[PDB]
């Protein structure tokens, strides 16, 4: 069948695919099949890229029979896959088995489910005509502006409060202190006025936060990093951080932001694009108002 | 600083810009509404912008409410937290309904809720209809002011139905409320030249120190009379006067250039414009003025029905035949801007050619197509009933064409004898 993947615990797959639902008109996922595992990447308007990686150890029947460069692609829809696995795995002790199949190239994506003498076979025809390949909103680690590690629960509360209030434009602030009083917050401007969601500074749930000087090795204290990010990009990672343990924040001088989600556990990587320029000269007043 | 039209608001009934007859027949209308039993439950005001359609009622409530300034003006920009805009107006009506005694606050709905979506437009009719036939003791006065202004043309309007063509009382309100017995429709007219000139005199003599500072005291008369004659809006006139007074000089003032009416356009096409002697510039300016009306059906029918009133049907039959032939040829262009231009140009050229025999004209009539459609619908439902009753006892298939042509008179004739 050129591809095999048997899954018993479909709850983990259901909640993993549920992190890609906030995308409007969800479709066109570039699923990667590799010996390491399965990775799902989805991009919206070439401004935000999210990658969800499933390890080989997650599947109990991973074979990956192939005689090629070990780089094979297929494009299918999200809403079909998202609702495919959530419907079953109900009641108790059902041990529902999920089977993945793909006959190399040109064949539909076959999904087989078994639940109490009840069998299904779902086929997904792939879209591989004008796959431009390459792509990727990646970044170089040599010029990382700063790095931060925060708990998922702390960030989820900030994002949930950031959404319902509005805040169509949001700001990211990073500032270190010689007295270990590191400052990092997700502040924003809306019709309400100024909102200052000040994240905690203690080491209880903020594991590490240091600001670099564009070399990723020279840590500097007293410097401030201001990031101007759209609200639409932040709304996508709100549900991703809803069920998570540690959230890693990393951005460079180029302005792209890399967010790593940890929840063996799976890893979710989200890439974001900074807006054009700071509104007026708000970078001056962000430092001035928060310092007061 | 402060706007002149805001700082010079009237304080009594002798300062408002309104005709004597209009003041009299709104005073008699509002006086009888305050009685416990009133012939008209609500008052409807329809007219152009800046015609004192709201301030007159404001001082009227100022001098009639304390008999037994309490005005409950609806604010459409209210949201009301977690309340839909459709239910906001419903809650406003019931909120102001409980003011029949002691308070007696008049209701002045100047800013009516926007009616463009299908759901919110249909709700606006029965909301005031439910307040009419309600058997409740006493009645608080309610005045609705609607400004007669045509909505400018937009893109991708799909079917392009009514209301969106022209924001007027007739378009939005349906027939049940228009000729309801408990309703009075007091139309409003633009401010007259004499009243505008008197008000500009009063403003100029009130601003004597400012006008005499510059070289405007000698020039003021020409500017104010030009402003008064050019437009009929008092607010726009005051704005233009304030702009000119602030201006140092050597500046050509501008005016709204308000759009003409439907019958006004019909008269312009048939009779002509005295302001613009040149024929080419009159039609070209009219096109860029209101293309939204010319690029619309029933205008060519209006030209077709009113072209015989140029000389009471006493002009050249050959010219009439040429005009009707040109309109018929224009009708084949699928309603294009080029089609409208050619027919109107031909009509104007012909009527200019025969303009010598135009001493006495006639009245124009808006075409009766609605009546023709109504009788067509009545005949259609009558034929449907006839087919329904004639198919329950035997078989009879002849299509719809034979029913209208052959069975429209023969069939009732045979049943008459039997």
């Amino acid at each position: 069948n050129k591809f095999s993947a048997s899954t018993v615990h479909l709850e983990h797959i259901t909640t993993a695919l549920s992190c890609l639902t906030p995308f409007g008109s969800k479709d066109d996922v570039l699923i990667f099949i590799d010996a390491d595992g399965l990775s799902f990447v989805r991009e919206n308007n070439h401004v935000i890229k999210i990658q969800l990686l499933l390890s080989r150890e997650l599947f109990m029947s991973y074979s990956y029979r192939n005689e090629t460069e070990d780089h094979m692609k297929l494009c299918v829809k999200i809403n079909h896959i998202l609702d495919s696995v959530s419907v079953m795995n109900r009641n108790s002790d059902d041990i529902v088995e999920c089977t993945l199949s793909y006959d190399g190239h040109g064949s539909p994506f076959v999904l087989i489910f078994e639940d109490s003498f009840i069998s299904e076979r779902v086929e997904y025809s792939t879209y591989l005509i004008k796959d431009f390949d390459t792509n990727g909103l990646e970044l170089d680690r040599e010029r990382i502006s700063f790095e931060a590690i925060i708990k998922g629960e702390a960030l989820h509360s900030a994002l949930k409060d950031l959404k319902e209030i509005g805040c169509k434009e949001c700001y990211v602030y990073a500032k270190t202190e010689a007295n270990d009083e590191n400052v990092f917050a997700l502040i924003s401007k809306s019709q309400l006025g100024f909102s200052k969601i000040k994240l905690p500074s203690n080491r209880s749930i903020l594991e590490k936060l240091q600001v670099f000087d564009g070399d990723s090795t020279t840590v500097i204290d007293g410097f401030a990093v201001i990031g101007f990010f759209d609200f639409t990009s932040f709304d996508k990672i709100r549900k991703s951080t809803k069920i998570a343990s540690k959230v890693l924040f990393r951005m460079d001088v180029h302005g792209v932001l890399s967010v790593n989600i940890l929840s063996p556990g799976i890893v979710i990587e989200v890439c974001m694009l900074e807006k054009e320029s700071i509104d007026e000269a708000a970078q001056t007043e962000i430092e001035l108002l928060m310092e007061t | 600083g402060e706007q002149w039209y805001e700082k010079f608001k009237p304080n009594c009934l002798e300062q408002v810009a309104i005709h004597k007859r209009k003041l009299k027949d709104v005073q008699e209308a509002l006086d009888a509404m305050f009685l416990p039993n009133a012939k008209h439950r609500i008052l409807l005001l329809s007219g152009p912008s800046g015609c004192s359609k709201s301030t007159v009622i404001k001082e009227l409530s100022k001098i009639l409410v304390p008999k037994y300034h309490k005005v409950t003006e609806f604010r459409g920009d209210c949201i009301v937290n977690d309340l839909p805009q459709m239910e906001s107006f419903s809650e406003f009506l019931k909120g102001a309904r409980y003011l029949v005694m002691s308070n007696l606050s008049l209701i002045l709905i100047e800013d009516l809720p926007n009616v463009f979506h299908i759901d919110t437009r249909r709700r606006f009719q029965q909301l005031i209809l439910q307040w009419l036939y309600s058997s409740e003791p006493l009645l608080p006065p309610l005045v609705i002011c609607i400004t007669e202004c045509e909505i400018p043309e937009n893109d991708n309007n799909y079917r392009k139905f009514g209301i969106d063509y022209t924001f007027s009382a007739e378009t939005i309100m349906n027939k049940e409320i228009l000729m309801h017995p408990r309703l009075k429709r007091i139309k409003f007219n633009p401010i007259n030249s004499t009243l505008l000139k008197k008000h500009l005199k009063f403003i100029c003599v009130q601003n004597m120190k400012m006008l005499k500072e510059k070289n405007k005291w000698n020039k003021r008369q020409e500017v104010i009379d030009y402003i008064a004659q050019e437009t009929g809006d008092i607010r726009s006139a005051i704005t233009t006067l304030q702009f000119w007074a602030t201006s140092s000089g050597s500046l050509p003032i501008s005016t709204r250039e308000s759009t003409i009416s439907y019958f006004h356009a019909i008269g312009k096409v048939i009779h002509g414009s005295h302001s613009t002697n040149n024929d080419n510039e009159m039609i070209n300016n009219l096109f860029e003025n209101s293309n939204n009306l010319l690029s619309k059906e029933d205008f060519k029918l209006g030209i077709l029905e009113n072209y015989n009133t140029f000389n009471k049907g006493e002009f050249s039959i050959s010219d009439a035949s040429s005009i009707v032939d040109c309109l018929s040829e224009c009708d084949n262009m699928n309603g294009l801007p080029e089609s409208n231009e050619y027919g109107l140009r031909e009509v104007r050229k012909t009527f200019r050619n025969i303009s010598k025999q135009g001493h006495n004209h006639g009245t124009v009539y808006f075409p009766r197509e609605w009546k023709v459609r109504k009788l067509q619908n009545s005949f259609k439902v009558q034929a449907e009933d006839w087919l329904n009753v004639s198919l329950y006892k035997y078989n009879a298939v002849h299509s719809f064409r034979n029913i209208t042509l052959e069975f429209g008179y023969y069939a009732p004739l045979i049943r008459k004898c039997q």
Partner: protein, 269 residues
């Protein structure tokens, strides 16, 4: 015009009585529903004209002190009321299942309003709700709106109430179809029989095959709309067993049997 009946709590018929509420949400979402009160134990109610046909009878013989009389000459009386207000009386009565047996449900037909009497206790609270509209229809409309229709052959006997996984499979079809937003069915006479449902799309190929289910000509292919999501909700019927019939490649019925009464649903092509 005396339409007076009393509804009281019991042990068995409450599940049959509480099954009535599920359609009431759907019926309120639909246009309306008709009624025909006859004699003392027979009444038929259905949705007037999608293709919503819900011929269902209820044994009013067990109901206490029920009588029908009207000026409709024959034994059949046209009756119609809006089902939106029927939710309010049922939902509020469902909150008082903890205590209260003598409260009853007193209904009186007076002209337009149908007063409903409650005697809930928290010292007693009296509630008097009125049904808004009971407007009738033309007498000739009774014949043209006859809801009695049934067919035979190709009887699928559903799985008996022994394993609860069969209902969950149908309930899975309820949640999935709402999430995506044609349905095809298979039928075989080979003995227990197998059920197969298949969905064909441009790229969505769903097929479900039952290997060893306990449920009981051939090749009855049929293509129909998504209106069957209502019929899956009627399968619950915890008191008794449900019947299903599908043939003629155009029509399908869902015969829900509970106590003496039976409930059927009709789907067109």
């Amino acid at each position: 015009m005396k339409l007076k009946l009393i509804v009281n709590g019991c042990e068995a018929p409450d599940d049959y009585k509480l099954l009535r509420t599920t359609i009431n949400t759907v019926a309120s979402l639909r246009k309306t529903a008709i009624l025909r009160f006859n004699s003392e134990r027979l009444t038929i109610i259905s949705t007037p004209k999608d293709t919503g046909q819900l011929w269902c009878t209820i044994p009013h013989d067990v109901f206490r002190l029920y009588t029908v009389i009207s000026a409709r000459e024959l034994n059949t009386i046209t009756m119609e009321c809006n089902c939106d207000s029927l939710l309010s009386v049922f939902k509020r009565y469902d909150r008082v299942m903890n205590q209260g047996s003598s409260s009853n449900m007193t209904i009186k037909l007076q002209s337009c309003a149908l007063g409903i009497t409650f005697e809930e206790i928290v010292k007693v609270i009296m509630h008097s709700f009125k049904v808004p509209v009971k407007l009738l229809f033309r007498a000739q409309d009774t014949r043209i709106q006859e809801p009695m229709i049934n067919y035979i052959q190709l009887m699928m006997y559903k799985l008996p109430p022994i394993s609860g996984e069969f209902g969950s499979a149908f309930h899975g079809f309820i949640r999935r179809v709402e999430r995506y937003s044609h349905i095809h069915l298979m039928g075989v006479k080979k003995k227990d029989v197998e059920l197969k449902i298949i969905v064909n799309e441009l790229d969505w190929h769903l097929e479900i095959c039952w290997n060893g289910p306990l449920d009981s000509s051939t090749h009855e292919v049929i293509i129909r709309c998504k209106d069957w999501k209502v019929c899956s909700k009627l399968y619950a019927a915890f008191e008794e067993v449900v019947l299903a019939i599908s043939h003629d490649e155009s029509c399908v019925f869902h015969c829900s049997l509970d106590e003496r009464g039976q409930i059927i649903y009709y789907i067109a092509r």
